[PDB]
Structure formats: structure tokens, C-alpha cells
């Protein structure tokens, strides 16, 4: 008794990151395959590269169990950072907004203290975790948002490891943005742990997805 997941005008990226124009009426839990247009209107509303994208669509294509849960709760994970960041490029009903499943972390009280956040998969299912790395268009923006010019983002899981050094770059304007957010994801097998360490530039997970590929 399994129907396809209909994404409407949205891409998998827009749907899985929580593009504010991509909330379905009935949030579905299992599905046979994903239906999406050749050029969906609404995907990465803040421009940037979605890494290993077709692979994620393959892996999300058949799903028997799907549960959203707040991996790093907004009102308790980040006491010393500003979490409320929105963007005009991710607007909804004419108001600036942001991906529902991510949080733009920025400085607080003139400081961006080094962060370190761990999550251990006790869901007894695979857990899909998504995050982003911000590349500002100039160094003034880098300092204003993150108070460092030597930023690092490191993500380590037992089956994925990567240290990002986001550098400044003035790219062509896309949805009014010259900077970029690059999007990444990893599937956490049960019992595995993921660690985020950063001193800036991290678009942090807020919601993750426990899932069974049945």
C-alpha cells in the first residue's frame, strides 16, 4: 500500500532541507519512489552546491519508515550563539525565512565561541543528517558574522570525515546572493556518532530524519 512521494514544484534538496515553500500538507512516512519535475522551481533557496545529490535521491527513493526529530534543539543547543538567522533569498509569504531543518549560527555579544556538538544515533534506524558551510562574498561579512578569518568546520562520523576551510568568494548574484552555502549530508548507521566542531561558517543541523529503507 505505497504511493509515490509527490514533491510538487520542489526538489529533493528543497524538501529535505526544509525550503520554506516546500512543506507538504500531509507529511508522509513511507513511499515507493519520489516524483519531481525536471527543473523544480524550489530547491536550495540560498544558492550553493548540494553534494552527492542524485545519490541522496536514490537513497531516499524507497523508504518504509521516516521520522523527523530535532537532533540539536534550537532552544538549548546554542546558548552562546545567535540562532535566529533568516534570509530574504529564502522568503515565505513575503517575509525572510530559512530552511526549517537547519540553523544559521552567528556571533552573540560580539563573539563566536568555538563550538563542539556530538550526536549518537540511538534511533535503532539510520539517521540522515544535513548541514551546510557558508562562504561569505567578502572578508567584512566573514568577520561580522563569525569574528574569525581562519574559519574551520570539521564533521567526523565513523564512516565520514571532512574538514572544511570555507574561503571568501564573490560569485555571480543568484537570488540576490553573491555568497554561497554548500550543503552536505551523511547517513548515520545505528550506534554511530557524528561530531561537529567549528569556529564559524556552520549551517548546523536542527532536524534530522530517522528512516528505514524497506
Amino acid at each position, epitope marked *: 500500500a505505497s504511493a509515490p512521494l509527490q514533491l510538487g514544484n520542489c526538489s529533493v534538496a528543497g524538501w529535505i532541507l526544509g525550503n520554506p515553500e516546500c512543506e507538504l500538507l500531509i507529511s508522509r512516512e513511507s513511499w515507493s519512489y519520489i516524483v519531481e519535475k525536471p527543473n523544480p522551481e524550489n530547491g536550495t533557496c540560498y544558492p550553493g552546491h548540494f553534494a552527492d545529490y542524485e545519490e541522496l535521491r536514490e537513497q531516499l527513493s524507497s523508504v518504509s519508515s521516516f521520522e523527523r526529530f530535532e537532533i540539536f534543539p534550537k532552544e538549548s543547543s546554542w546558548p552562546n550563539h545567535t540562532t535566529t538567522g533568516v534570509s530574504a533569498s529564502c522568503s515565505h509569504n513575503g517575509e525572510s525565512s530559512f530552511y526549517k531543518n537547519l540553523l544559521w549560527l552567528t*556571533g552573540k555579544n560580539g563573539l563566536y565561541p568555538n563550538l563542539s556538538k556530538s550526536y549518537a544515533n540511538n534511533k535503532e534506524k539510520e539517521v540522515l543528517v544535513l548541514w551546510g558551510v557558508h562562504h561569505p562574498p567578502n572578508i567584512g561579512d566573514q568577520r561580522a558574522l563569525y569574528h574569525t578569518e581562519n574559519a574551520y568546520v570539521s564533521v567526523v562520523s565513523s564512516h565520514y570525515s571532512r574538514k572544511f576551510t570555507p574561503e571568501i568568494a564573490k560569485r555571480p548574484k543568484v537570488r540576490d546572493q553573491e555568497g554561497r552555502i554548500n550543503y552536505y549530508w551523511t547517513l548515520l548507521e545505528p550506534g554511530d556518532t557524528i561530531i561537529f566542531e567549528a569556529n564559524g561558517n556552520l549551517i548546523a543541523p536542527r532536524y534530522a530524519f530517522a528512516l528505514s529503507r524497506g
Partner: antibody
Amino acid sequence: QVQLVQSGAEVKKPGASVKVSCKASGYTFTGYYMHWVRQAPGQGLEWMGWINPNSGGTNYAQKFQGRVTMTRDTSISTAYMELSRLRSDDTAVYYCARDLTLMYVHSSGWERGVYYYYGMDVWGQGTTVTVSG
Amino acid sequence: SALTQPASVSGSPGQSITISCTGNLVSWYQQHPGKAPKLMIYEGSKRPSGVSNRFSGSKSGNTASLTISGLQAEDEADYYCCSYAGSVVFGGGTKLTVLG
């Protein structure tokens, strides 16, 4: 060196209007709210209102609503306060003052998304406006 | 909607004074005569970068306080508390004299 440089001393007649300018340097003008505060001779500070230079939205003090107009020109990083129907007891020093909270970083498309007043951390040198008939 | 400060306070050099503000996100400003105000304390007790830790803020009941330790003559000035409830409200101000 973050700095607010205000326009020069003004002398006006009662019933006139005065427009004071406040030019920001050393930071991105659209990133922070801009308050106006005045102080009559020997008196305390009194808030006049704020403008959000990114959007142009304003919030005026009860004492001045109906009489004060705040505007800005972002291309020249300048805030303006116009106060009309002047009376002698509008003689005062008028200060522009930057709100301390970073609210926007427009070249990165970042917005704080929520506003609360925590204080004013950079101030202009002040403008003397004398009203006399 | 208004905050009440004492009209004046005085202290000898090296002492500590406390200025009160009765009505915790109060901010405090120092103004020397003829010069622009200066932010000394915000959010009740934080100091902006570069402000001396001789200045500290505290609360108690419906009273916020600014304490200055190790008074120096340059601390002679007017002090304003400030709060907000949809509108920014300054206290009436305290003239602090460092007795000479």
C-alpha cells in the same frame, strides 16, 4: 574606527522645521538600527525614535510622533531626522546613536530576524539646534 | 513607564559608589559635560569591549545598580540608566561628583 558624523549647528524660527544629518563610517550602515536622542540644556537624555536603515521602518517616541520624521539614504550611509513645528523648548543638542545589535549583513543575505533593544554603543558628536523667535 | 535615579551622588577618590535605577536588560551611559554619552553596561552587567571592569552592573528586586570601584576624578560625569518596553526609556540621570 566606527564613527557617526553629524551635521552642523542650526538656528531656526518657531514654527520652522530642521533636518539633522548623521553620516556613518567604519561599518556597514544598513547593519544596525539608528536611534535619535536629544538633550535640552541642563536636562536628561530623551529618546526620539529609531529607524531601521535596511528597511526604512521607523518607531517614534510618544512625545514626538506626529512631529518627527526619520529617513535614510543608504547609498551615502546617512540617517536623517526632521523635526517640524519647532518651539523654543526644542532648543537642544540632538544625537544620532547606533543600536548595538547587528541586525543585517546584506551582502551575505543574513538577517537576525528578531529585534530587541539592548543599548546604543556608538554616538555622533551631537548637533545644536537653537529655536528662537 | 519611567526609571528613577538619584539626582546626585558623591565619593572620594578610591572609594566605590553605587547608583540605583528603580522601575534585567538595563543599560548604563556615562556623559561628561558637552560630550556625547558613552555606553558602560548593557544587558544588566556586560561591558562593551574596552570599558573598564571597575564598572559593573547588578540587579535586586525592581532595582538595577551601577557600581564604580576605585573612583577616579575622570569618573565625575552624569550617569543614565536605560530600559525598554517597546519604547526606549532613559532614567532622569545622576550627577556623580568625585570630591576634590
